[PDB]
Amino acid sequence: DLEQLTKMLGRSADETIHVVHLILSSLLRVQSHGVLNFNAELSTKGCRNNWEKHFETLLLRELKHLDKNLPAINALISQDERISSNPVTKIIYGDPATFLPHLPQKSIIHCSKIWSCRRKITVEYLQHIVEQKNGKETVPVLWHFLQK
Amino acid sequence: CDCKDKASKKFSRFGIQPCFICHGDAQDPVCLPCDHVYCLRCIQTWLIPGQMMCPYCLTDLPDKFSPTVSQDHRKAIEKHAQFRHMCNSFFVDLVSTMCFKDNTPPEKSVIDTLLSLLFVQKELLHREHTKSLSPFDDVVDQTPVIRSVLLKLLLKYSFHEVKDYIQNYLTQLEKKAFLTEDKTELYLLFISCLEDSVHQKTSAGCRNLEQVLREEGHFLRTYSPGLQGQEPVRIASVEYLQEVARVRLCLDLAADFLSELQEGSELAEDKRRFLKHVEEFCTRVNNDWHRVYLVRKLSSQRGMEFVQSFSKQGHPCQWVFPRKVIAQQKDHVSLMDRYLVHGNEYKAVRDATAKAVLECKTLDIGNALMACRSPKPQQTAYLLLALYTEVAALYRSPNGSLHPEAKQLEAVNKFIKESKILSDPNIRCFARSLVDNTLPLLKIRSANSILKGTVTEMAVHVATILLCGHNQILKPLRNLAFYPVNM
Ligand SMILES: [Zn+2]
């Protein structure tokens, strides 16, 4: 499941782990109880499906609202005061690598963002992109092609 | 084009035009007495000084911009906008499908006219915009945007015959659009389009791994540096960006091979030679930005603790790290605290819990807990997770193993007996098991020893959430974690 989630989201490994911690943390402060009328034992399929519907409601309410949080979490965890001294998280996790003195000078092609990493676009990221951007009305054939 | 213009005269009485000011379609359309359709915002910011006249035909407007047309002009602009969208979709489908059918490229002058129909050259008034592949003139963006559709559709051919065309497009964009701006974004866009083109020319092509490894090795050992040419401020040939994208895929292949290397066995005596050539390439040139790219790719594909396991003191893969980062790195490289997602109220209580770890005074955690808002469930989760991260950072590290047994469990147990914030008997039966290391999640016995840490963290995180969370949509999962005979 961890391999499939870091394949499926077009993030790094740490950022997909940050996504899972976001969903576990976000499922706590959601105090509004309207989750009545199901058996607390999971004994009938109607009670399980109603649990599914409310838990799908909360997961979509938190999965819509992550892309405006993850750069701030990368700033705070990049500026924690015990890893910041370790010189491996500065050349990776959100600091420019120009403090390394043995380096080529400031060129137009040797900026840090030009030597950054990026995604390898796969099918699972396409399936994630079709479900956030309302794929059931506008683009139905691609959703059914990626489903099976 | 003349289909569109005879269409417009069929639509709405000889010439629906864009506003002369904004160069685009009108919103809240005001009609002049001389059949002019302008924007409402443009005419309210334009007409109010002493220029009560026309921008196009120089006709004096008598009273005021009082006639708005709530019947004709919205549906007229709507139909003409639907028609321009359908015709531009038509044009882009023709240049995608029929202009680029087979493996031979089209002629020179058709490519010159496609690259020249992206520009909307001088008109008397912002000059020199860029448009979204339209055969028309009356569509605008009042900021010069640069797309990548024609770039990917030119690079479906062999790269040897489309160098000068994209080069000339680059000289045009530099001479009119990106003179002195952030050329880093466009250069990264060009590097990404060339590397996507080589991904397409390799993956959709049919050849084995040995030939591509031999030819990229021959690229490596015959790589003239030549970096003084396209360096200084403006010179960026497409050969230079092709060399940088090609060495980025070589380092991508090498990082894939290293991630394969750490997980498993020996690499069949030819991947070893390829990684040896990558080692010789990176130790020959001092262009260690590409080594920064290598470590960013290895950190992206596997994780931070992966390159931490690479960062030891005699591993025969040490050459993937620059010369300064290894001599000033100790062996006490601790781990990341992923629970700062809570943020600025877990950080205070974990700092005070580290204080009560180092000293024997335990009131500091209580002072930090009363220095916080956001009440009782999350506060209990912060406290229990702080206790976990402190006893874990003690027990994992070989220097300070089993530190709360050194006369310090009495202090934290006194805090348990005093503070009623966690002396609830389910939280209490959790916390007694967490203090004396008798919780059966640390003995998860995964022998890989890197994802084992993550699995322990996920298990104690979901257990902390299920205990501290008093919520209806956690009532099944609690039964899944503490009453399996009742399941
Ligand atoms: Zn206008």
Side-chain angles (χ1 to χ4, degrees):
Chain A
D1 291 331
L2 70 92
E3 62 86 18
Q4 196 264 359
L5 275 296
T6 189
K7 299 306 166 223
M8 191 275 259
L9 283 296
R11 303 291 182 183
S12 170
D14 291 332
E15 293 179 353
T16 56
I17 299 168
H18 275 16
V19 167
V20 70
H21 288 283
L22 293 174
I23 287 294
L24 289 69
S25 65
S26 67
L27 62 83
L28 181 61
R29 82 290 180 276
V30 68
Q31 278 72 237
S32 179
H33 290 89
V35 196
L36 281 76
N37 297 114
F38 69 99
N39 290 318
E41 300 291 326
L42 293 177
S43 63
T44 59
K45 293 294 188 291
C47 296
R48 184 179 163 260
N49 290 319
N50 199 294
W51 167 84
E52 290 292 340
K53 181 266 290 181
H54 290 130
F55 188 65
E56 180 179 2
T57 296
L58 65 93
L59 292 188
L60 288 174
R61 286 177 185 177
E62 295 295 324
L63 280 168
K64 65 101 179 177
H65 198 271
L66 62 92
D67 217 355
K68 277 74 71 177
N69 202 11
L70 187 58
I73 198 169
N74 202 318
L76 283 294
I77 298 174
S78 178
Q79 204 69 244
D80 199 353
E81 293 85 3
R82 70 189 185 277
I83 309 307
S84 299
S85 70
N86 189 4
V88 183
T89 199
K90 336 189 202 185
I91 71 173
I92 296 299
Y93 188 73
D95 186 73
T98 61
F99 64 94
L100 301 171
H102 188 194
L103 79 168
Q105 56 264 31
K106 181 66 175 66
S107 300
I108 195 65
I109 298 84
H110 293 101
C111 182
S112 299
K113 293 175 71 175
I114 294 170
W115 294 102
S116 176
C117 177
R118 63 181 76 223
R119 292 136 294 271
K120 184 176 180 180
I121 298 299
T122 60
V123 293
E124 293 86 2
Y125 180 71
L126 295 174
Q127 184 173 1
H128 176 74
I129 196 67
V130 65
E131 290 84 4
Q132 72 289 17
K133 72 174 188 324
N134 297 115
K136 189 271 291 183
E137 69 281 16
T138 66
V139 58
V141 55
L142 281 66
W143 177 18
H144 295 281
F145 182 75
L146 281 296
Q147 270 174 263
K148 297 183 290 294
Chain B
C1 183
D2 64 357
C3 179
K4 189 261 292 180
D5 313 318
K6 180 67 174 66
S8 66
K9 288 81 73 179
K10 182 182 287 294
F11 286 116
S12 178
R13 191 184 179 273
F14 190 68
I16 290 302
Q17 294 94 18
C19 177
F20 180 74
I21 299 169
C22 70
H23 292 226
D25 291 331
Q27 56 94 34
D28 294 332
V30 56
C31 64
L32 274 74
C34 59
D35 196 2
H36 286 172
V37 188
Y38 286 168
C39 298
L40 184 62
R41 59 177 178 86
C42 293
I43 197 63
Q44 67 89 29
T45 194
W46 188 78
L47 193 61
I48 53 170
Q51 53 183 358
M52 178 59 108
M53 66 77 68
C54 177
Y56 184 76
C57 71
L58 307 179
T59 300
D60 293 331
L61 192 148
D63 196 3
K64 191 176 172 66
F65 51 91
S66 296
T68 178
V69 182
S70 179
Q71 296 100 21
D72 293 331
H73 283 102
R74 278 85 67 192
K75 294 150 187 92
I77 293 171
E78 181 170 29
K79 292 186 286 185
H80 186 71
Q82 291 182 82
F83 183 74
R84 75 168 66 252
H85 293 89
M86 292 182 284
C87 288
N88 293 326
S89 65
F90 165 69
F91 188 29
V92 299
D93 290 333
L94 269 63
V95 179
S96 70
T97 47
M98 282 73 74
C99 294
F100 288 149
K101 302 168 174 85
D102 296 354
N103 59 4
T104 180
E107 292 179 353
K108 184 175 181 179
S109 62
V110 56
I111 293 173
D112 295 330
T113 55
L114 62 83
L115 61 77
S116 69
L117 71 91
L118 285 175
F119 292 153
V120 59
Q121 296 92 3
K122 306 289 180 67
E123 61 269 18
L124 182 63
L125 270 298
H126 187 196
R127 303 291 175 91
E128 301 293 334
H129 300 281
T130 303
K131 313 303 176 68
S132 65
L133 275 297
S134 179
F136 297 158
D137 57 330
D138 57 357
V139 59
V140 72
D141 192 359
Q142 58 271 17
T143 48
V145 294
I146 292 174
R147 270 68 170 175
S148 66
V149 58
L150 285 183
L151 283 296
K152 281 191 171 181
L153 281 296
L154 285 172
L155 283 295
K156 316 295 194 184
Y157 297 104
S158 66
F159 179 73
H160 188 273
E161 59 190 1
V162 293
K163 292 184 285 185
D164 49 353
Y165 293 159
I166 61 169
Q167 183 70 42
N168 189 359
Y169 180 22
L170 175 138
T171 58
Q172 288 175 355
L173 61 83
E174 289 177 354
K175 73 181 177 66
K176 70 180 69 178
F178 277 177
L179 279 76
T180 317
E181 284 88 3
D182 47 357
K183 295 184 285 185
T184 51
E185 294 293 327
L186 175 139
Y187 290 161
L188 62 78
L189 181 141
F190 279 18
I191 291 165
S192 185
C193 291
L194 283 67
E195 66 183 0
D196 292 331
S197 180
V198 71
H199 280 292
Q200 294 179 175
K201 291 272 285 186
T202 56
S203 295
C206 180
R207 66 181 64 88
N208 54 2
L209 187 63
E210 63 271 2
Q211 287 293 85
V212 293
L213 282 180
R214 180 178 176 274
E215 61 86 18
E216 297 297 327
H218 187 273
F219 178 75
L220 288 171
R221 289 180 290 176
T222 63
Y223 187 107
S224 66
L227 297 175
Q228 70 273 17
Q230 287 86 16
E231 183 179 2
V233 287
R234 311 280 162 196
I235 297 97
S237 72
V238 292
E239 292 87 3
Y240 186 77
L241 299 178
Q242 191 272 331
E243 289 179 354
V244 306
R246 183 178 187 164
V247 301
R248 287 182 66 176
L249 289 78
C250 288
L251 294 174
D252 183 74
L253 204 67
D256 291 335
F257 291 161
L258 292 172
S259 176
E260 184 262 1
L261 190 148
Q262 181 37 264
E263 63 71 28
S265 66
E266 196 270 331
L267 278 74
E269 194 269 331
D270 186 76
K271 331 295 150 179
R272 296 290 181 181
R273 205 149 67 84
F274 178 74
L275 291 173
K276 181 176 72 175
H277 291 130
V278 175
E279 180 178 1
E280 292 177 354
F281 179 79
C282 70
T283 196
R284 182 178 64 189
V285 69
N286 57 1
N287 195 1
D288 67 331
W289 288 98
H290 70 272
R291 190 174 293 171
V292 175
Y293 173 71
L294 197 152
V295 304
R296 284 180 177 177
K297 180 61 74 177
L298 279 173
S299 84
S300 68
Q301 291 180 356
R302 295 292 297 274
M304 186 52 205
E305 206 194 5
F306 187 73
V307 306
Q308 293 302 290
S309 67
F310 287 171
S311 71
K312 64 179 290 295
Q313 302 296 322
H315 196 251
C317 291
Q318 190 177 2
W319 54 267
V320 308
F321 291 159
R323 296 178 64 87
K324 188 265 288 180
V325 76
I326 46 172
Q328 50 100 22
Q329 189 176 4
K330 310 306 179 293
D331 291 331
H332 298 71
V333 291
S334 61
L335 296 174
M336 57 177 163
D337 45 356
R338 275 197 309 305
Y339 307 108
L340 189 155
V341 61
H342 299 99
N344 293 318
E345 282 85 10
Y346 178 74
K347 183 65 182 294
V349 299
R350 72 174 303 275
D351 288 331
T353 311
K355 296 296 185 292
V357 160
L358 60 89
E359 68 184 359
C360 188
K361 191 199 74 190
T362 187
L363 187 62
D364 51 355
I365 187 52
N367 296 121
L369 286 172
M370 192 275 268
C372 292
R373 82 290 184 276
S374 71
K376 179 67 179 66
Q378 40 183 302
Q379 294 175 357
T380 47
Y382 295 164
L383 175 61
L384 267 61
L385 187 58
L387 178 62
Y388 176 38
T389 190
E390 292 294 325
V391 306
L394 290 166
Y395 189 69
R396 145 52 188 81
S397 178
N399 53 4
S401 296
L402 296 175
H403 193 199
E405 285 81 2
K407 276 77 67 178
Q408 291 171 354
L409 75 163
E410 60 70 28
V412 62
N413 283 317
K414 180 67 174 66
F415 182 74
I416 296 299
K417 297 293 121 179
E418 180 180 1
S419 63
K420 303 288 104 177
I421 189 66
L422 77 169
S423 175
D424 178 77
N426 196 1
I427 303 286
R428 185 46 182 151
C429 83
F430 184 78
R432 291 177 298 174
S433 68
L434 197 54
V435 62
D436 65 1
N437 296 115
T438 59
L439 184 72
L441 292 173
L442 195 144
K443 51 183 186 65
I444 210 65
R445 62 177 177 87
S446 179
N448 200 359
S449 70
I450 298 297
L451 74 164
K452 185 261 182 184
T454 64
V455 172
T456 51
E457 298 299 325
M458 294 299 103
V460 303
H461 188 254
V462 70
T464 306
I465 289 300
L466 287 173
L467 292 175
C468 296
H470 300 285
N471 197 358
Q472 184 63 251
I473 198 77
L474 291 175
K475 296 287 96 175
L477 289 177
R478 285 174 158 197
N479 287 117
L480 294 172
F482 297 97
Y483 263 96
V485 295
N486 206 6
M487 173 36 58

